Amino acid sequence: ATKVAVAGASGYAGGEILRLLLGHPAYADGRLRIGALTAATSAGSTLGEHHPHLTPLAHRVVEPTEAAVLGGHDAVFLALPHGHSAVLAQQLSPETLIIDCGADFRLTDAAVWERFYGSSHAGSWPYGLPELPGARDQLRGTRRIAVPGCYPTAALLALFPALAADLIEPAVTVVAVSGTSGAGRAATTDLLGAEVIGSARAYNIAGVHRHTPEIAQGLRAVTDRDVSVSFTPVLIPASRGILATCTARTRSPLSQLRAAYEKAYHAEPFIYLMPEGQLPRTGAVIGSNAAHIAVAVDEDAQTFVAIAAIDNLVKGTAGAAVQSMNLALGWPETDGLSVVGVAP
Amino acid sequence: ATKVAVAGASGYAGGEILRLLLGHPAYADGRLRIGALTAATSAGSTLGEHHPHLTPLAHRVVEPTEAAVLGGHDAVFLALPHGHSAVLAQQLSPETLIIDCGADFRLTDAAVWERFYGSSHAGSWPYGLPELPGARDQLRGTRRIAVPGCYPTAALLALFPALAADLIEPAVTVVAVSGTSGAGRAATTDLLGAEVIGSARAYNIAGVHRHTPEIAQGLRAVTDRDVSVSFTPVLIPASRGILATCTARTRSPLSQLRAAYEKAYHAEPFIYLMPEGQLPRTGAVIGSNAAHIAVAVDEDAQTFVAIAAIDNLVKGTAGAAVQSMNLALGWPETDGLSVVGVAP
Amino acid sequence: ATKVAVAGASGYAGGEILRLLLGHPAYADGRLRIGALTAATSAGSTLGEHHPHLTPLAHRVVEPTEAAVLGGHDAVFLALPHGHSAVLAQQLSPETLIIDCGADFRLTDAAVWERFYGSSHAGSWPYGLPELPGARDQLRGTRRIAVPGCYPTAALLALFPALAADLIEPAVTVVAVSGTSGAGRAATTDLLGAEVIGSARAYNIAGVHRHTPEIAQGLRAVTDRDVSVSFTPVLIPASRGILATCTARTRSPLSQLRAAYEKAYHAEPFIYLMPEGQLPRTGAVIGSNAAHIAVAVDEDAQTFVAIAAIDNLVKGTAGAAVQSMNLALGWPETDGLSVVGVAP
Amino acid sequence: ATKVAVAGASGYAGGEILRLLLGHPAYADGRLRIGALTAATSAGSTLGEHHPHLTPLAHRVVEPTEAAVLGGHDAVFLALPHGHSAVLAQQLSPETLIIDCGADFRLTDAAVWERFYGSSHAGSWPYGLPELPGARDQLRGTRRIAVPGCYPTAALLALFPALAADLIEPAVTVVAVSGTSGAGRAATTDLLGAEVIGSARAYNIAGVHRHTPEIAQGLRAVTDRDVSVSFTPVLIPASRGILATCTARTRSPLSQLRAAYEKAYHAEPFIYLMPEGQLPRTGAVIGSNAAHIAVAVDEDAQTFVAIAAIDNLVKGTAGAAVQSMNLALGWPETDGLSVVGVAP
Ligand SMILES: O=C(O)C1c2ccccc2Oc2ccccc21
Ligand SMILES: O=C(O)C1c2ccccc2Oc2ccccc21
Ligand SMILES: O=C(O)C1c2ccccc2Oc2ccccc21
Ligand SMILES: O=C(O)C1c2ccccc2Oc2ccccc21
């Protein structure tokens, strides 16, 4: 049996991990058990006060996020996508399966880390994006998982097959729209409903967003050419969803680009290549662990266009974490993870 | 095995029935098969062109809605919440399980039917709201189910325990907000995104809405008093969800009303009574078959207040249909029906 | 000339007052001048950092909210709809025209005030709802204005003509949906976009909302019958707008009720009575100072239904303040206040 | 006095033209009169049945769109952004001021027109984007105006100063999010509220969108180089607003690019260059004729980034039409056109 703790249970990523665990077949047959649920504030409150959608766990008392509380759990989700978990991870029993939703163990270049995060690089753990070349093998039986960022998940799935096949130039452009749950649950004026509803805005533009080097790192793993990444995130008035529009120069026939996506994804159950003449929409993947992808060539502009839609909280965060957890535990990789969206 | 057809498969209710069937344990172990998917238009198209979220069924070819196509199935969902199924249903065998999402077999008073629907009364089938007193008995082993309207589902769950215990007056007021998927998929200018987004409006007010007599009928069934119903629906800029605010005069203490709701709902798997101090929200029930209910007493106004939140497409439509299906077939009532919402 | 200060300039009400002042004909011809803009935090920031829509004032430096900063202004808007301005108002020069967006000077019953607000009653100032009987005369040349709450504005406009004519019973029910800007700009988890989008919820139900006695007070001014108010507010995923559904028992002919609304509003430029067969929508009044009102009778339920739509930030807050300011200064009452909404 | 007709009055662009005319100073002092309001359907209905926000015109009777009805007016708005006005415009006098919101007279290359629109090229009229180099000269005293498309307006304001100064490469990438009112009022299933709310999707990708050659044409006019345009539009769940993210390779320093934008826009009343450290948002420009623009350089990616926010219905359509009208008639260009957004 695997007893699971969720640190940061009261945030959006933590609530979504718990939603997926409650629906997981190992929860139903007793193999997966939900233990301590912790938060940095509001210890002593009940979970229902934070996540009224999780009624089977409503009565659970939130505990402080402390190593002692997290002891005795075979797996610990560090559900702080915008936090720094290196210090807490060091405090846990090292045989624990530690699944970090944050960034501390994602990057593999210490100088890049220090430039973008302002601290000493902690190192890296197996990246929880099983569809990326070579990634699945590193996750089988791992006791450490670095969950990818939500935007890099969409951009890498959209772009890596074309670049791996050397069919596009290695200077890529990504403009990705995101619902606001990706910002997490910390209350700020700029994330208030009145501000977000009816409005769209780019933010952290022109290379300052910390997911820029994460996209570059994933792409550099499938090519030896010099990769550059122009990444612009755009907040839109939705709660969930990322639609990444990804471009690069190309002079390759569309059919050869489509063949590269076929080769990458034909046997990947969470990656859906759109039928000819269809394009992804985030509405179709909400609540699912799926990515819907379409590709095209703008011949006049000599530009490849790849569109990818994911649910930022599922395939971009908690679904990635659970998918990687399945691989870590030797369980069927698709367990608990639907490809069917909740639409409209 | 139970071979199931879905007529009206390309509409919202039909797509949500299919989502639930795809996740149903009887589909997973082969006891339930998804057969013919039909529509009144676009026969020959594929389901993926209508429901991109249902990728496991994307290649299914939509067939014409005809009694011949629907014969040879053990169960038939008539997934036309705004259609009139009487003529088609009369062509199907009494032994075929028919689950009608439309209104034709909901009402038990022919004169009321004629007044509000302007046609001859087709009859009455067991009402697919298993939590109503006596309803579960009528559904077990039925081959006929009339699924309730979405607004009546919310209003009846909010009000029937108080009224059945004679703890409120039988003159009730319901003001219910709803997302736009309740209107179905028929394109009209009043339901365009640009019109609906950022706007709220009441419609079909002051007793002309056809769900008014349906609420009255369900409430009359739990009391011996003349029931009157003031029902105002309000369209809001959401795709799913109904939040029903329901009021009635009372002279009874809150403690007695609370006890009546506990007694009615403590063992009901889909009905969640909010802990004291918490109130329902539609976000918490989206994608689930749950209803979240809270009750209160306005002492100064001598008024009972009951709030109910449901997903209009699940507990208000397709989830009720599948729940009643489970009962009709002798399967565990909760099969395929989660109480956990997809939030935020 | 009238030099105007706005205290609380960085909140939503303060930003909307400034929007209306910038468009006011007295600003254009030099008679109205915009002076100090203050806030409790962020003094030294520029206004553009808080209200990027107010580009003509973007460079203004926010000053601390202090009596000394507000001196030398002929009119001071206390744009703190959820604050308590009695202490600051006492510090201003008493000949100043003081326009309080908060509640401290709205209520006329000290015991009611203490019950709902937990403090000693400060008194009352002329209520800034000029269409209410007797209200306009108290605002002409006043140096004090208590701006109404947003929900009472909608409910009182919907209900007072029927009650004044004694055509409905004095026990009224109000269920009002509101966009989230009415909560103000203080960051809380429950007002975050991810939480608000796609969700609706009632709050402060069963008589605990402080606008309940404000509605009762306005209605008691048009009748000597004992008034009771059941008031339920519902948050919906819009930034602006209140749609109030208001009911009461009646046995009066609809035509007599319509005549009462005609008598009240035929000469009121901001009150639009819907043509027969039309119903209000908040989308149609956004950005305008208008209220759109329809009335009906549910004969089966013996219930009067009145629907009122306003923009909560204009007719429900800042437009009420500017309308009352015009009356205070002896300026045309409609100056700077459009009846045309910004739709879709 | 200038008697104005609006053909297509019942659509979104027509309603927004009428909103602006109602607030125009020439309407207030009688120099502009609103004459015939026409549509291709529902002649005989009243305007209030189409545009409930335009209550001062609610009683106007919609007339058939015919050259006879439109004659006898000094100015005619053809408010059909997706219509083809060539045949109707050829029936009107050269001395009548015609302002076409549609595309028929925008393009200057007949072969490009035939390729993208599949019809004979009707000709070219002065392009209604007064801020483009040389455009104001062409509009003064014209009797013919082709209003720009909404996406080209945003992309050209974002990009032309950099390209005209030869500070970026002439291969540009535009990814622009838009609210749904840009689609007009024609009811289709893909534009239903339930579909659009909570979803984002790219459409008409990889060079098939008809605004691609329009962007290319406007950019070609400021440079001597071959221009290529990769343009991806993305529909988001808002009613109004376009946020264009525009990129191009560059070797020029940020200081030089910033200076070029200051030089181009410092005296342009509707173009607001964001203070350093601020970025545009569509919420800040809704209901205004303003464009908010920020520029940046991604040094690692050697990429220039320009962000532009407009209201698609004002600066992208009806505001551009009225602005160009003012120029054609010799009225102050800013008459009736505020730069202040209606936010939140
Ligand atoms: O961009 C990010 O890294 C992340 C985010 C992700 C998706 C959408 C919005 C969003 O905003 C914030 C705000 C604070 C901290 C992190 C984020
Ligand atoms: O009210 C209804 O009966 C139903 C509906 C339900 C929820 C939300 C909107 C809505 O609108 C329409 C429109 C056409 C036909 C039926 C409906
Ligand atoms: O209800 C209110 O009095 C007011 C409010 C008005 C409209 C919409 C939401 C809303 O929520 C809050 C939250 C905090 C303080 C005041 C409010
Ligand atoms: O893209 C366009 O040309 C235009 C449009 C503009 C903004 C947003 C959506 C939108 O969709 C449609 C649909 C039909 C016809 C034109 C459009």
Question: Residues near D238 by Cβ (< 8 Å), separated by ≥ 6?
Answer: A198, A199, A200, A236, A237, B197, B198, D179, D180, D282
The type of residue at C51 is: H
Nearest CA to ligand 1 atom 14: A183
* B81: helix, strand or coil: coil
CA distances from D213 to D109, D186, D251 (A): 10, 24, 26
CA–CA separation, D141 vs D67, rounded Å? 23
**Do B311 and B150 form a contact (C-beta atoms < 8 A)?**
no
CA distances from D325 to B166, D31, D32, D122 (A): 68, 13, 11, 21
The type of residue at C74 is: D
> Positive or negative CA dihedral for A6, A8, A10, A13?
negative
- Order the strands of the B63-64 sheet from edge to edge: B63-64, B32-39, B2-7, B75-78, B97-100, B144-146
CA–CA separation, B328 vs B339, rounded Å? 20
CA–CA separation, D219 vs D226, rounded Å? 10
CA–CA separation, C168 vs C159, rounded Å? 9
**Centroid of ligand 1 to alpha carbon of A190 (angstroms):** 11
Atom of ligand 3 nearest to the CA of C210: 3
**Do C213 and C248 form a contact (C-beta atoms < 8 A)?**
no
**Tokens 């846990």 belong to residue:** A92
Nearest CA to ligand 1 atom 16: A183
**Do B291 and B129 form a contact (C-beta atoms < 8 A)?**
no
CA–CA separation, B146 vs B101, rounded Å? 6
Which residues of chain D have a Cβ shorter than 8 Å from any chain B Cβ?
12, 179-181, 183, 185, 187-189, 191-198, 237-239
**Do C172 and C232 form a contact (C-beta atoms < 8 A)?**
no
Q: Give the DSSP H/E element, type plus range, for residue B113.
A: helix B110-117
**Do B199 and C279 form a contact (C-beta atoms < 8 A)?**
no
Cβ–Cβ gap B193/D12 under 8 Å: no
* Nearest of A251, A231, A253, A233 to residue A242 by alpha carbon: A233
CA–CA separation, C38 vs B133, rounded Å? 60
Residue A203, token pair as written in the block: 């933010």
For A181, name the nearest residue in chain C, comparing CA atoms only.
C194
Q: Could you tell me whether strands A171-178 and A228-235 are parallel, antiparallel, or unpaired per DSSP bridges?
A: parallel
Backbone angles phi, psi at A301, to 5 degrees: -90, 0
For A10, name the nearest residue in chain C, comparing CA atoms only.
C189
> Considering A36, A62, A135, A150, which one is annotated as catalytic?
A150
Q: Which residues pair with C144 in a beta bridge?
A: C98
CA distances from A83 to A7, A13, A101, D98, D235 (A): 11, 12, 8, 59, 32
Total count of residues recorded for chain C: 344
Residue C267, token pair as written in the block: 């000469």
For the CA of D203, the nearest ligand: 4
The type of residue at C229 is: V
**Do B43 and B64 form a contact (C-beta atoms < 8 A)?**
yes
CA–CA separation, C214 vs C229, rounded Å? 10
Q: Give start and end residues of each alpha helix (H) in A66-206.
A: 67-70, 86-91, 110-117, 135-139, 150-164, 193-196
D76-113 in b/e burial notation, b at 16+ Cβ within 10 A?
bbbbbbbbbbbebbeebeeebbbbbbbbbbbbeeeebb
User: Cis before residue B344, ω within 30 degrees of 0?
Assistant: yes
Residue B131, token pair as written in the block: 């939590």
CB of B178 closer than 6 A to ligand 2? yes
Q: Give start and end residues of each alpha helix (H) in chain D.
A: 12-22, 25-28, 67-70, 86-89, 110-117, 135-139, 150-164, 193-196, 211-220, 254-265, 319-329
CB of A183 closer than 6 A to ligand 1? yes
Q: Give the DSSP H/E element, type plus range, for residue C116.
A: helix C110-117
Based on C-alpha coordinates, what's the Rg of chain A? Answer: 19
**Do B200 and B177 form a contact (C-beta atoms < 8 A)?**
yes
User: Cis before residue D344, ω within 30 degrees of 0?
Assistant: yes
CA–CA separation, D324 vs D129, rounded Å? 8
Total count of residues recorded for chain D: 344
Q: Give the DSSP H/E element, type plus range, for residue C27.
A: helix C25-28
Q: Could you tell me whether strands D201-202 and D228-235 are parallel, antiparallel, or unpaired per DSSP bridges?
A: antiparallel
For the CA of B116, the nearest ligand: 2
Task: For residue A192, give the nearest of C193, C237, C238 by CB distance.
Answer: C193
Q: Could you tell me whether strands A228-235 and A201-202 are parallel, antiparallel, or unpaired per DSSP bridges?
A: antiparallel
Question: Residues near B160 by Cβ (< 8 Å), separated by ≥ 6?
Answer: B132, B133, B218, B219, B222, B264
CA–CA separation, B197 vs A108, rounded Å? 44
Experimentally determined by: X-ray
* Nearest of A336, A334, A338, A329 to residue A139 by alpha carbon: A329
Provide the terminal-to-terminal Cα distance of chain C, rounded to the nearest Å: 37
* Nearest of B336, B295, B314 to residue B150 by alpha carbon: B314
CA–CA separation, B344 vs A53, rounded Å? 9
Cβ–Cβ gap B194/D188 under 8 Å: no
What residues in A contact C188, CB-CB < 8 Å? Answer: 187
- Order the strands of the C97-100 sheet from edge to edge: C63-64, C32-39, C2-7, C75-78, C97-100, C144-146
Domain ranges of chain B: 1-147+313-331, 148-312
* Nearest of A207, A219, A158 to residue D305 by alpha carbon: A207
Q: Give the DSSP H/E element, type plus range, for residue C308.
A: strand C303-310
Backbone angles phi, psi at C248, to 5 degrees: -165, 155
How many Cα neighbours within 13 Å face the side chain of A253? 3
**Do D270 and D339 form a contact (C-beta atoms < 8 A)?**
yes
* Nearest of A76, A215, A17, A210 to residue A132 by alpha carbon: A215
Q: What is the dihedral of CA D11, D12, D13, D19, to 10 degrees?
A: 110
**Do D106 and D89 form a contact (C-beta atoms < 8 A)?**
no
Q: How crowded is residue B186: how many other Cβ atoms within 10 Å of its Cβ? A: 11
Q: Which residues pair with C233 in a beta bridge?
A: C176
Residue D136 burial by Cβ neighbours in a 10 Å radius (0-12, 13-18, 19+) = middle
For the CA of D233, the nearest ligand: 4
C101 is catalytic: no
Atom of ligand 2 nearest to the CA of B81: 16
Nearest CA to ligand 1 atom 9: A183
Based on C-alpha coordinates, what's the Rg of chain C? Answer: 19
Angle at C144 between CA C138 and CA C146, to 5 degrees: 85
* D77: helix, strand or coil: strand
SS3 content of chain C, % helix, strand, coil (to 5): 30, 20, 45
* D82: helix, strand or coil: coil
CA distances from D310 to B192, D152, D191, D307, D340 (A): 22, 11, 21, 10, 12
Q: How crowded is residue A169: how many other Cβ atoms within 10 Å of its Cβ? A: 18
Cβ–Cβ gap D179/B191 under 8 Å: no
* A251: helix, strand or coil: coil
**Centroid of ligand 1 to alpha carbon of A183 (angstroms):** 4
Q: How crowded is residue A20: how many other Cβ atoms within 10 Å of its Cβ? A: 24
CA–CA separation, B270 vs C111, rounded Å? 44
* Nearest of B91, B97, B94 to residue B74 by alpha carbon: B97
* Nearest of D67, D128, D80, D72 to residue D96 by alpha carbon: D72
CA–CA separation, A242 vs C22, rounded Å? 38
Q: Which residues pair with D304 in a beta bridge?
A: D248, D297
Question: Residues near A123 by Cβ (< 8 Å), separated by ≥ 6?
Answer: A105
Backbone angles phi, psi at D11, to 5 degrees: -85, 180
Q: What is the resolution of this structure in A?
A: 1.7
For D241, name the nearest residue in chain C, comparing CA atoms only.
C344
Breaks in chain B (C–N beyond 2.5 Å) sit after none
Q: Give start and end residues of each alpha helix (H) in chain A.
A: 12-22, 25-28, 67-70, 86-91, 110-117, 135-139, 150-164, 193-196, 211-220, 254-265, 319-329
Q: How crowded is residue A214: how many other Cβ atoms within 10 Å of its Cβ? A: 25
Backbone angles phi, psi at D182, to 5 degrees: -60, -20
Tell me the DSSP string of C58-70.
TTPBPEE--HHHH
**Do D81 and D211 form a contact (C-beta atoms < 8 A)?**
no
CA distances from C76 to C100, C313, C334 (A): 8, 18, 20
Q: Give the DSSP H/E element, type plus range, for residue D146.
A: strand D144-146
Q: Which residues pair with D177 in a beta bridge?
A: D234, D243
Angle at C216 between CA C210 and CA C221, to 5 degrees: 135
CA distances from C41 to C9, C11, C83, C84 (A): 11, 11, 14, 16
Tell me the DSSP string of A13-29.
HHHHHHHHHHTSHHHHT
> Positive or negative CA dihedral for A120, A123, A129, A135?
positive
